[PDB]
Design a protein around this ligand. Structure first.
Ligand SMILES: *CCC(=O)N1CCC[C@@H](Nc2ncnc3[nH]ccc23)C1
Length: 274
């Protein structure tokens, strides 16, 4: 049930790639007759990376929420998760933009905020919150995924300092992450603000965090950190409700201690409805 025999995991396709592993679509088919259930299987494509992967597995196994991708088990080596055929929220928002209204965007925002609130209560920093890392379960249900960069906060420290700088697109990182590699539940809040912006632009590539920050934009990271320190922010998405934009601005407070908490954002997102 929680142990998946390797010989019964039948390879179908690649669901994703992202340093230093792959997510594959597999069918767990012990009968070998193509009637078994579909599963998403993560594996490393390294000694420290192996320690990193086993930590990811321990983090995800211990998470139990409707807004967090379900852990199924392991195969001995590989992490088995539930398969969400709708895939990432980024690509989903692009294919269904003429269908999802403000209410719907607000429902996804609420569900993600509930998921982050729960991660925070687990002393877990996600570090990579973005629409491409969030999965769609159904039309009215999103779940947070990709815990490959997630960190557990020690009981006496509310932040974590990363040794080597990030390998993710710089446009989701908080100023303190860009300058000092400081990651905390508050830097996750900053990233959540960028997710709100992604939602309200339906992840449109022309006004995307990368496209729009680059045109507002010496190394690029230092230049982005300069824009941000001056108080420059991403513009309100086209037709964005003022209140949603005011929330993104709060998430984007310069000092981590001034950003609203996930528990304060939730009732506010729910009040705007869905
Ligand atoms: C945006 C493309 C996309 O759908 N992605 C990014 C690559 C990894 C994919 N992960 C994934 N897809 C389906 N079901 C999953 N369960 C766990 C991880 C899963 C998402």
């Amino acid at each position: 049930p929680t142990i998946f025999e390797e010989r019964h995991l039948k390879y179908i396709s690649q669901l994703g790639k992202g340093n230093f592993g792959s997510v594959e679509l597999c069918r767990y088919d012990p009968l070998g007759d193509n009637t078994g259930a579909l599963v998403a299987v993560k594996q490393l494509q390294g000694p420290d990376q192996q320690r990193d992967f086993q930590r990811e597995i321990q983090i995800l196994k211990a998470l139990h929420s409707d807004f967090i991708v379900k852990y199924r088990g392991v195969s001995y080596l590989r992490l088995v998760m539930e398969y969400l055929p709708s895939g990432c929220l980024r690509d989903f928002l692009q294919r269904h933009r003429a269908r999802l209204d403000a209410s719907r965007l607000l429902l996804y925002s609420s569900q993600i905020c509930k998921g982050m609130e729960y991660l925070g209560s687990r002393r877990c920093v996600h570090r990579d919150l973005a629409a491409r890392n969030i999965l769609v379960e159904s039309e009215a249900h999103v779940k947070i995924a990709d815990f490959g960069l997630a960190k557990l906060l020690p009981l006496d420290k509310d932040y974590y300092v990363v040794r080597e700088p990030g390998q993710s697109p710089i446009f989701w990182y908080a100023p303190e992450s860009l300058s000092d590699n400081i990651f905390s539940r508050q830097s996750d809040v900053w990233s959540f603000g960028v997710v709100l912006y992604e939602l309200f632009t339906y992840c449109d590539k022309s006004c995307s965090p990368s496209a729009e920050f680059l045109r507002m934009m010496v190394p690029a990271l230092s230049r982005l950190l300069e824009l941000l320190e001056e108080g420059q922010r991403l513009p309100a998405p086209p037709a964005c409700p003022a209140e949603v934009h005011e929330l993104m601005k709060l998430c984007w407070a310069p000092s981590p201690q001034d950003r609203p908490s996930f528990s304060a954002l939730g009732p506010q997102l729910d009040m705007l409805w869905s």
